Amino acid sequence: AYGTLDSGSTKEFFRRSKIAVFDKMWTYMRSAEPSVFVRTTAEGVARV
Amino acid sequence: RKSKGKYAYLLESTMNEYIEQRKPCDTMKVGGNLDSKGYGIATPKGSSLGTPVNLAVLKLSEQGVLDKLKNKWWYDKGECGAEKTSALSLSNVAGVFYILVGGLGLAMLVALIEFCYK
Amino acid sequence: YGARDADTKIWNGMVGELVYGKADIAIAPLTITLVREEVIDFSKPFMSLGISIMIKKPQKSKPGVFSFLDPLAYEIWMCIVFAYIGVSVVLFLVSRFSPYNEFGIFNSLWFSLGAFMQQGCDISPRSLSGRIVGGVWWFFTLIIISSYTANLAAFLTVERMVSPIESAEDLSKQTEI
Amino acid sequence: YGARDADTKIWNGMVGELVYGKADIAIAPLTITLVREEVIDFSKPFMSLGISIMIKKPQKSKPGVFSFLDPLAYEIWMCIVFAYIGVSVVLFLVSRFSPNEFGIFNSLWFSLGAFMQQGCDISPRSLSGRIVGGVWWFFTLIIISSYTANLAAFLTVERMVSPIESAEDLSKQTEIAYGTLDSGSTKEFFRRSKIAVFDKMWTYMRSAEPSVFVRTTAEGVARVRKSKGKYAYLLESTMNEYIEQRKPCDTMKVGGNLDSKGYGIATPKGSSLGTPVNLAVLKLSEQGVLDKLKNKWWYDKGECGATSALSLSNVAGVFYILVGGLGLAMLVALIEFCYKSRAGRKALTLLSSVFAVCGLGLLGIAVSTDYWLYLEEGIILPQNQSTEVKMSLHSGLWRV
Amino acid sequence: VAGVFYILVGGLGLAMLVALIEFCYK
Amino acid sequence: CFLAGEERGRCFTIEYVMVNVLKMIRSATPFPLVSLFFMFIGFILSNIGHIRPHRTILAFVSGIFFILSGLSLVVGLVLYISSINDEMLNRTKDAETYFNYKYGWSFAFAAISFLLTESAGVMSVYLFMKRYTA
Numbered sequence: 072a073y074g075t076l077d078s079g080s081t082k083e084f085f086r087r088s089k090i091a092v093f094d095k096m097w098t099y100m101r102s103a104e105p106s107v108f109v110r111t112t113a114e115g116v117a118r119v
Numbered sequence: 120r121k122s123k124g125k126y127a128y129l130l131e132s133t134m135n136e137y138i139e140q141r142k143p144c145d146t147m148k149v150g151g152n153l154d155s156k157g158y159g160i161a162t163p164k165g166s167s168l169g170t171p172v173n174l175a176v177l178k179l180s181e182q183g184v185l186d187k188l189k190n191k192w193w194y195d196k197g198e199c200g201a202e203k204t205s206a207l208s209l210s211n212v213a214g215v216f217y218i219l220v221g222g223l224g225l226a227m228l229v230a231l232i233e234f235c236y237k
Numbered sequence: 238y239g240a241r242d243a244d245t246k247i248w249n250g251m252v253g254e255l256v257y258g259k260a261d262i263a264i265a266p267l268t269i270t271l272v273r274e275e276v277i278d279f280s281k282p283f284m285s286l287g288i289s290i291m292i293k294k295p296q297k298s299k300p301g302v303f304s305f306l307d308p309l310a311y312e313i314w315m316c317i318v319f320a321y322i323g324v325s326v327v328l329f330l331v332s333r334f335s336p337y338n339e340f341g342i343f344n345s346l347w348f349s350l351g352a353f354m355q356q357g358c359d360i361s362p363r364s365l366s367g368r369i370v371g372g373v374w375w376f377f378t379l380i381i382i383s384s385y386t387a388n389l390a391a392f393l394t395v396e397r398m399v400s401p402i403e404s405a406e407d408l409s410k411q412t413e414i
Numbered sequence: 415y416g417a418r419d420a421d422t423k424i425w426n427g428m429v430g431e432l433v434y435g436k437a438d439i440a441i442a443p444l445t446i447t448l449v450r451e452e453v454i455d456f457s458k459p460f461m462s463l464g465i466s467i468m469i470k471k472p473q474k475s476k477p478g479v480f481s482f483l484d485p486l487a488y489e490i491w492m493c494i495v496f497a498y499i500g501v502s503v504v505l506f507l508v509s510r511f512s513p514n515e516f517g518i519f520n521s522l523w524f525s526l527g528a529f530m531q532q533g534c535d536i537s538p539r540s541l542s543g544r545i546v547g548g549v550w551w552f553f554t555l556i557i558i559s560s561y562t563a564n565l566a567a568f569l570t571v572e573r574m575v576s577p578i579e580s581a582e583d584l585s586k587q588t589e590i591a592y593g594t595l596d597s598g599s600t601k602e603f604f605r606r607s608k609i610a611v612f613d614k615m616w617t618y619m620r621s622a623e624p625s626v627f628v629r630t631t632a633e634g635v636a637r638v639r640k641s642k643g644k645y646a647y648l649l650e651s652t653m654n655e656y657i658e659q660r661k662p663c664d665t666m667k668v669g670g671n672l673d674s675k676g677y678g679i680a681t682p683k684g685s686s687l688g689t690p691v692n693l694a695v696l697k698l699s700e701q702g703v704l705d706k707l708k709n710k711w712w713y714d715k716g717e718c719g720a721t722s723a724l725s726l727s728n729v730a731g732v733f734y735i736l737v738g739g740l741g742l743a744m745l746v747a748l749i750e751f752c753y754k755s756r757a758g759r760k761a762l763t764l765l766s767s768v769f770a771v772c773g774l775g776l777l778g779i780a781v782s783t784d785y786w787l788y789l790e791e792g793i794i795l796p797q798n799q800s801t802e803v804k805m806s807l808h809s810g811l812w813r814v
Numbered sequence: 815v816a817g818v819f820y821i822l823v824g825g826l827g828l829a830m831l832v833a834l835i836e837f838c839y840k
Numbered sequence: 841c842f843l844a845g846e847e848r849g850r851c852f853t854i855e856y857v858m859v860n861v862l863k864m865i866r867s868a869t870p871f872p873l874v875s876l877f878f879m880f881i882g883f884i885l886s887n888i889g890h891i892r893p894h895r896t897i898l899a900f901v902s903g904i905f906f907i908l909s910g911l912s913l914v915v916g917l918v919l920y921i922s923s924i925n926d927e928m929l930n931r932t933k934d935a936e937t938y939f940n941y942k943y944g945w946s947f948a949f950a951a952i953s954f955l956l957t958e959s960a961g962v963m964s965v966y967l968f969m970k971r972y973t974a
């Protein structure tokens with residue numbers, strides 16, 4: 072399961088991306104239970 | 120699910136493709152369809168909506184909107200998607216044990232019989 | 238969805254809400270039917286569908302008693318047994334008809350047994366004709382045992398499930414499922 | 415079938431004959447399209463269909479009788495025999511020159527049952543003989559392990575082979591070239607498709623040298639057949655099921671459909687015929703007449719019909735060596751006792767010298783010539799895979 | 815697998831030496 | 841008999857209404873019975889044969905019954921263990937469940953009783969051949 076910080080340029084990259092790989096990756100991340108999005112970078116490093 | 124691969128359920132193909140993408144990932148759709156039907160948008164008989172609705176369904180079909188919405192609701196919002204070899208268990212090789220003891224059982228008989236009847 | 242009662246002749250569901258006036262359009266999984274398009278207007282189908290078969294996904298099978306035999310077909314295991322009798326009879330006819338004796342019919346079975354299970358000897362056949370029976374069955378064994386191990390390794394590496402049925406023609410012929 | 419010309423705005427088909435009054439109904443495989451139902455009526459579809467994939471029915475490989483030798487190259491099996499001689503000969507020599515049970519008759523027999531890992535009785539009691547047996551003991555440990563491991567690699571890679579069962583399988587696996595007819599609804603499907611799989615498939619097909627697009631359906635069916643696994647043809651679902659039932663029974667239809675179309679019965683947009691025809695089609699659908707007629711013309715008039723364990727076809731020559739090994743052993747017990755029931759060094763004198771005379775000569779005439787190594791080379795074409803040679807060559811030890 | 819051939823002939827070469835040496839020097 | 845799963849001490853000792861692991865160990869049941877039967881008949885022949893050594897013939901056919909007991913005790917354990925693994929295969933495979941079988945001391949004492957009654961059988965062939973000697 073791969074994720075992104077919940078608010079920034081990285082999340083808005085995939086949200087508006089019209090490249091076939093990154094369009095598929097955004098489809099996975101928006102529709103994922105439990106949430107793959109972390110709230111802080113240090114939270115996202117810990118979850119790795 | 121609770122018949123261990125001994126009950127096949129004949130149902131419509133759109134639910135069959137939907138339940139296959141639910142949790143558990145236990146069920147599977149096999150074969151092709153058996154009949155052919157369609158789902159249509161219905162209006163009352165004699166209505167201003169009818170002819171623009173019919174030309175809308177054909178426009179959404181050929182632009183790919185109706186295929187896009189089905190991938191969305193059946194597969195992209197689908198729970199099921201789309202290793203590490205395990206040790207051999209005893210149930211796989213239990214036959215050479217039964218042939219071993221069955222080979223020792225038939226060997227003690229030939230011992231106890233023939234030496235007495237020498 | 239909408240059906241018509243045999244007595245009251247009244248349409249239920251989303252159909253009767255179009256026949257009688259509660260609604261203007263019914264966007265739904267509503268099947269285009271003969272008895273329904275006599276009373277309403279459908280569009281062209283937005284979704285095509287049909288009757289299909291649902292089975293539980295095939296998992297790993299249960300192992301039978303003779304599951305260990307399965308890397309080789311039963312056509313092979315029979316022809317090994319025929320050939321085991323075959324090389325012991327010929328080893329006897331080597332020994333009985335004008336030998337170089339010690340290799341009886343019960344001994345020639347015993348030389349070819351430990352040969353095929355790759356387990357030494359007791360005594361070399363000491364003829365030349367006994368050697369060719371002994372030597373060729375030793376190469377037979379080597380290929381068969383290596384083909385057992387190599388085909389079992391392919392099975393254990395690549396997990397490949399099959400479904401019992403593949404169509405409704407298959408369901409009609411069987412009675413197990 | 416019918417298409418409005420962009421210049422003259424004139425329909426040119428069966429749609430033309432309905433718009434321009436020449437006919438009253440078109441009962442034909444006419445696709446329900448947007449631009450057509452703007453000018454004519456259509457019934458509900460009497461046949462649903464879509465774009466499908468046509469591949470060749472895969473193949474089976476025929477085990478050529480000595481296929482059990484295939485895990486090792488023929489140069490290995492040759493040098494196993496040359497090493498079997500060599501270890502037998504060195505045994506007898508070491509054994510004679512020692513303080514014997516061994517003959518070269520026995521030394522052929524030690525070296526074989528050690529190759530087959532079947533044990534031996536004659537032990538090379540000299541420690542100079544123990545070096546002979548010990549290295550041939552390790553030789554066949556590495557040869558038997560290499561046979562089993564390369565055969566396991568074959569049977570694993572053949573079991574990892576997965577056939578095409580979707581358009582996503584064609585999307586990923588680029589070893590099979592897939593194509594479309596060069597002008598129709600199938601090519602214009604991929605050209606305007608904004609679905610991620612079909613957008614990738616169009617990217618492959620537009621950028622492909624040589625051209626994957628065929629010009630005729632019968633051309634596209636032929637290219638499936640003369641490619642042996644390498645072409646897939648994207649066509650309509652109903653022609654795919656029909657050609658599957660023809661002669662030769664060579665191709666097959668894989669997957670589901672890639673889109674959804676329908677064939678309708680068309681009337682000239684004003685007709686009093688259009689409403690009873692629409693209710694006729696829905697009556698023939700629910701009385702099973704339309705599925706009955708498809709079985710009749712696709713399958714009842716079809717020119718075709720309608721295990722993972724290792725088979726005897728594969729290990730067949732290991733029985734033919736076994737029978738031939740028993741058949742030769744009936745010959746020996748015949749002639750050896752006929753030697754015994756009838757039971758010198760000058761033949762030993764003659765043979766040993768006369769073998770050397772050819773022996774000195776055969777190596778001598780071979781080393782001085784230049785036909786040791788043939789070497790063909792060149793480029794191929796997909797023109798029936800016919801080959802021209804742009805480098806023929808010979809070689810010798812020095813004379814090339 | 816050319817290595818087990820060189821070890822085979824190299825094993826036969828070192829075996830004929832031990833034969834020709836030691837039986838003469840018995 | 842159960843434990844912490846709903847904490848009930850319901851020793852069902854199943855003969856009627858109810859998992860299928862407990863039905864497959866019903867299938868393996870006759871083999872530790874026949875083994876225990878051949879242990880007992882191997883000893884009640886052994887106990888009287890300490891009183892009557894008089895021909896020789898006793899401790900041989902009891903030693904047959906010591907060895908035939910352990911061989912049916914092997915088939916008892918193989919059928920028992922394979923019946924576990926057949927049903928551990930068919931449970932369900934989620935990444936959120938865990939099944940854990942474990943063999944207890946009651947299983948182990950049956951397996952220790954193999955080696956004793958087999959080694960008892962080995963000495964039972966010994967002193968039979970000592971009284972056939974004497």
Ligand SMILES: CC(C)CCC[C@@H](C)[C@@H]1CC[C@H]2[C@@H]3CC=C4C[C@@H](O)CC[C@]4(C)[C@@H]3CC[C@@]21C
Binds near residue numbers: 217220224225302
């Ligand atoms: C002398 C010997 C061979 C006597 C034979 C009895 C034993 C060894 C045999 C060998 C194969 C076994 C079988 C193997 C498993 C099957 C299916 C199982 O659900 C119940 C027991 C059953 C039906 C058989 C019963 C017992 C059986 C254990």
Ligand SMILES: CC(C)CCC[C@@H](C)[C@@H]1CC[C@H]2[C@@H]3CC=C4C[C@@H](O)CC[C@]4(C)[C@@H]3CC[C@@]21C
Binds near residue numbers: 820823824828
């Ligand atoms: C009694 C025996 C071992 C004497 C040794 C001579 C032979 C057998 C040896 C064994 C290993 C071989 C080697 C193997 C191949 C290498 C690399 C090649 O590019 C040139 C020859 C060279 C460098 C070696 C020379 C010859 C060599 C053939």
Ligand SMILES: N#Cc1ccccc1-c1cc(-c2ccccn2)cn(-c2ccccc2)c1=O
Binds near residue numbers: 300389392723
């Ligand atoms: N697993 C396993 C196994 C272990 C030892 C010996 C044989 C097998 C085995 C092999 C095969 C097989 C089949 C084809 C090709 C190669 N191998 C199959 N099975 C098996 C497994 C489950 C159910 C039935 C058979 C087996 O149990």
Ligand SMILES: N#Cc1ccccc1-c1cc(-c2ccccn2)cn(-c2ccccc2)c1=O
Binds near residue numbers: 483564724
């Ligand atoms: N399958 C098989 C098989 C069984 C026993 C012995 C050999 C083979 C076999 C091996 C190989 C092979 C090839 C390369 C590397 C390793 N193995 C090939 N074949 C084979 C199968 C079908 C047709 C032709 C050859 C074979 O039949």
Ligand SMILES: O=c1[nH]c2cc(C(F)(F)F)c(N3CCOCC3)cc2n(CP(=O)(O)O)c1=O
Binds near residue numbers: 134239
């Ligand atoms: O117009 C109709 N459209 C229908 C559409 C669906 C669905 F699949 F949900 F879209 C279903 N289901 C089938 C599976 O179980 C859930 C309900 C029934 C429908 N029925 C009644 P039926 O076909 O007589 O059973 C109609 O009449």
Ligand SMILES: O=c1[nH]c2cc(C(F)(F)F)c(N3CCOCC3)cc2n(CP(=O)(O)O)c1=O
Binds near residue numbers: 598652
């Ligand atoms: O209404 C249409 N119905 C069509 C029906 C078929 C057929 F399958 F034969 F029924 C075919 N073919 C597809 C390939 O084999 C030969 C002819 C083309 C049709 N086209 C033209 P396209 O779809 O633009 O290529 C239509 O327009």
